Design a binder for this molecule. Structure first.
Ligand SMILES: *[C@@H]1O[C@H](CO)[C@@H](O[C@@H]2O[C@H](CO)[C@@H](O[C@@H]3O[C@H](CO)[C@@H](O)[C@H](O[C@H]4O[C@H](CO)[C@@H](O)[C@H](O)[C@@H]4O)[C@@H]3O)[C@H](O)[C@H]2NC(C)=O)[C@H](O)[C@H]1NC(C)=O
Ligand SMILES: CC(=O)N[C@H]1[C@H]([C@H](O)[C@H](O)CO)O[C@@](O[C@@H]2[C@@H](O)[C@H](O)O[C@H](CO)[C@@H]2O)(C(=O)O)C[C@@H]1O
Ligand SMILES: *[C@@H]1O[C@H](CO)[C@@H](O[C@@H]2O[C@H](CO)[C@@H](O)[C@H](O)[C@H]2NC(C)=O)[C@H](O)[C@H]1NC(C)=O
Ligand code: NAG
Lengths: 171, 316
């Protein structure tokens, strides 16, 4: 994708994460754990639902049309009837091929984008108390018990609390 | 200290989709946009479906006796079966396709009898080619005129349209196999049928000659039609061979059509109908049949197109 997170700097996905699309894994003093991020997950799903509903939006209802199969050879008029329908079908077949190609490239790029948004947001949250290892992981340079980890995940982590501690361990 | 890794989900069995850059790339999930299956059955709701059974629309229109059950019927979709057969006097319709289309589109066979006066001819002619009960008969909506005594005078009749709707008149011309038959039935050696309005006229000369034997006759009837608008007038003039109308069909405009299909009709609800049967219309495209009726996905040549409903799948 355009942002280079999914199938990029994040090496792979997590089959274990079944309660969300994006999220967190940690190691601290108290052990390891895993939690889905709901807001990133929902942003992606909402956008995909949006495009799905646009695509499956019934647009056409047709009644009496032209005949499309013929039991006798007729020539000119029938040639035209067949050609009209064949022309139409090819144009619609093209529209359909293009639509899915554009939609799917964009779906891959937007999901890659939401991963990246979550990553940059977390990075900003941690300020000078952490560093980007480059594989989607932050090394946090202070003691971060489960309460502290959940604080980063639910958006409450005050970086000023741990700054002195962390600046020291970094330098 | 501590480690906090950001990541995304994956699944063991992803699905392949197409993009701008890749004709196959794996995502966590996708959904199908091409409807490729049917039940094999035409749902009887919400459209009024009329099964022609043994009858073409044209035979029901004319009133072939085995199609009498279709008198004054209406439909959103008339369904013609491949087993249908004609069983009345042998006939052709120049521009059959147009007559079938206009009637199909009108959506009704509602017929109003009118009091035509055919002075000096015998009415209600019939044939063993077209049995009605045990005896000889004819198309219900047509009136086969022949000589009375030893004369067939010039028929000259008018029927004005003083209604506020269009009238469809179905009429015909008889083509004898022999000169003997011509003079026997119509006296004059050569007949003539002229049907006109203020706006149009059709004149047909019968042709005498053998055609192949069909249901007892080497003769034929040719079928024509004339629409009469409000305030206009029908005139029919003939010195022989007229197969007269008994009245007119009322015409409508609306959503009615016709379809060739052998799918059975069933009790269910489907907006979209194909000759293969009803299909769902949740998907935007379909590959079942280019012939459709109703709120239908658009026909495409692809039998599958996957819309990605998830991210790129990068497993463990
Ligand atoms: C076969 O049937 C048709 C349909 O009815 C029939 O048409 C009618 O012909 C008559 C004349 O033959 C038409 O009468 C005319 O009507 C207008 C007004 O609408 C009058 O102005 C006319 O008057 C003049 O012409 C007269 C006849 O020569 C004169 O005597 C008079 O002095 C005036 O100059 C005339 O009365 C009638 O309108 C039509 N009807 C329709 C519906 O068109 C036709 O005549 C029949 N054909 C045969 C060969 O019998
Ligand atoms: C209205 C009328 O004259 N009806 C006749 C009918 C016609 O004269 C005939 O269909 C014109 O082509 O003829 C009927 O008799 C037929 C014979 O004329 C024909 O030569 O042989 C037929 C049997 O194969 C048949 O007997 C008819 O069609 O039944 C008699 C009818 O009253
Ligand atoms: C729907 O009906 C059409 C019309 O018969 C089917 O088209 C035929 O399909 C077979 C392929 O299995 C061919 O041998 C025929 O020549 C096709 N005929 C035409 C006119 O295209 C079509 O396959 C049916 N589709 C479904 C899903 O039932
Ligand atoms: C994906 O969407 C489908 C609907 O086609 C659903 O049934 C399935 O549980 C969802 N997730 C998958 C297959 O990963």
């Amino acid at each position: 994708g355009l942002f280079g997170a999914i199938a990029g700097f994040i090496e792979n996905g997590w089959e274990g994460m079944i309660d969300g699309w994006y999220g967190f894994r940690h190691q601290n003093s108290e052990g390891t754990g895993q939690a889905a991020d709901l807001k990133s997950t929902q942003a992606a799903i909402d956008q995909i639902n949006g495009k799905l509903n646009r695509v499956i939006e019934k647009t056409n209802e047709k009644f009496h049309q032209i005949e499309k199969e013929f039991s006798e050879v007729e020539g000119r008029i029938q040639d035209l009837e067949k050609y009209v329908e064949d022309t139409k079908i090819d144009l619609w077949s093209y529209n359909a091929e293009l639509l899915v190609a554009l939609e799917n490239q964009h779906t891959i790029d937007l999901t890659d984008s939401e991963m990246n948004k979550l990553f940059e947001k977390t990075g900003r949250q941690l300020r000078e108390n952490a560093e980007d290892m480059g594989n989607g992981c932050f090394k946090i340079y202070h003691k971060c018990d489960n309460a502290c980890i959940e604080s980063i995940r639910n958006g409450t982590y005050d970086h000023d609390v741990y700054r002195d501690e962390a600046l020291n361990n970094r330098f | 200290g501590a480690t906090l890794c950001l990541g995304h989900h994956a699944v063991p069995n992803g699905t392949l989709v197409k993009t701008i850059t890749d004709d196959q790339i794996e995502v966590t999930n996708a959904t199908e946009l091409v409807q490729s299956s049917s039940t094999g059955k035409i749902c009887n709701n919400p459209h009024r479906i009329l099964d022609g059974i043994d009858c073409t629309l044209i035979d029901a229109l004319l009133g072939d006796p085995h199609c009498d059950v279709f008198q004054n019927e209406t439909w959103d979709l008339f369904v013609e079966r491949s087993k249908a057969f004609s069983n009345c006097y042998p006939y052709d319709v120049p521009d059959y396709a147009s007559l079938r289309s206009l009637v199909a589109s009108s959506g009704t066979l509602e017929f109003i009898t009118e009091g035509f006066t055919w002075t000096g001819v015998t009415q209600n002619g019939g044939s063993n080619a077209c049995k009605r009960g045990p005896g000889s008969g004819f198309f219900s909506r047509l009136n086969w005129l022949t000589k009375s005594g030893s004369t067939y005078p010039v028929l000259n009749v008018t029927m004005p349209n003083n209604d506020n709707f269009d009238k469809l008149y179905i009429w015909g011309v008889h083509h004898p196999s022999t000169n003997q038959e011509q003079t026997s039935l119509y006296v004059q050696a050569s007949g003539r049928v002229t049907v006109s309005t203020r706006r149009s006229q059709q004149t047909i000369i019968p042709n005498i000659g053998s055609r192949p034997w069909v249901r007892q006759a080497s003769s034929r009837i040719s079928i024509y039609w004339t629409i009469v608008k409000p305030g206009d007038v029908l005139v029919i003039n003939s010195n022989g061979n007229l197969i007269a109308p008994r009245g007119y069909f009322k015409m409508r405009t609306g959503k009615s059509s016709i379809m060739r299909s052998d799918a059975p009709i069933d009790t269910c609800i489907s907006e979209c109908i194909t000759p293969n049967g009803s299909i769902p219309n949740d998907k935007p495209f379909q590959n079942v049949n280019k012939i459709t009726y109703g709120a239908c996905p658009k026909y495409v040549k692809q039998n599958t197109l996957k819309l990605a409903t998830g991210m790129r799948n990068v497993p463990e």
